[PDB]
C-alpha cells in the first residue's frame, strides 16, 4: 500500500477570497473529477491490505 492523500479544491486554488470562488463556479466539474479520483484510490488502498 501507499500513502493515502486528499486534495481540497477550495483551499488549494483559492486563498479564501470572495472573488476567487465566484470564478471557480464557472469552471464547474474540473476539480470534482480530481477529488473523486483520489477518493477512489483511497478505497483501493484499503482493499490491497
Amino acid at each position: 500500500s501507499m500513502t493515502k492523500t486528499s486534495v481540497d479544491c477550495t483551499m488549494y486554488i483559492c486563498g479564501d477570497s470572495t472573488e476567487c470562488s465566484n470564478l471557480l463556479l464557472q469552471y464547474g466539474s474540473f476539480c470534482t473529477q480530481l477529488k473523486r479520483a483520489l477518493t477512489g484510490i483511497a478505497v483501493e488502498q484499503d482493499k490491497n491490505t
Binding site: 500500500s1 501507499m2 492523500t5 486534495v7 488549494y12 486554488i13 483559492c14 486563498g15 477570497s17 472573488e19 476567487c20 470564478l23 471557480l24 469552471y27 474540473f30 476539480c31 480530481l34 479520483a37 483520489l38 484510490i41 483501493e44 488502498q45 490491497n48
Partner: protein, 49 residues
C-alpha cells in the same frame, strides 16, 4: 501573472484587468492538479500489480 498572491491581483489591478489575471492563476493551479492526480493514478496501477 505579475504577482502570485490572489489578494495582490484584486487590490492592485483594475477590476476589468484582474479578471484576466485571476483566470490565469486558477488555470495554473488546475494544471498543477492535472499533473498530480494523473501521477497518483499511474502509481496506483503500479502498486496494484
Amino acid at each position: 501573472a505579475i504577482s502570485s498572491v490572489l489578494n495582490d491581483i484584486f487590490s492592485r489591478l483594475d477590476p476589468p484587468e484582474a479578471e484576466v489575471q485571476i483566470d490565469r492563476l486558477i488555470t495554473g493551479r488546475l494544471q498543477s492538479l492535472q499533473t498530480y492526480v494523473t501521477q497518483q493514478l499511474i502509481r496506483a496501477a503500479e502498486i496494484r500489480a
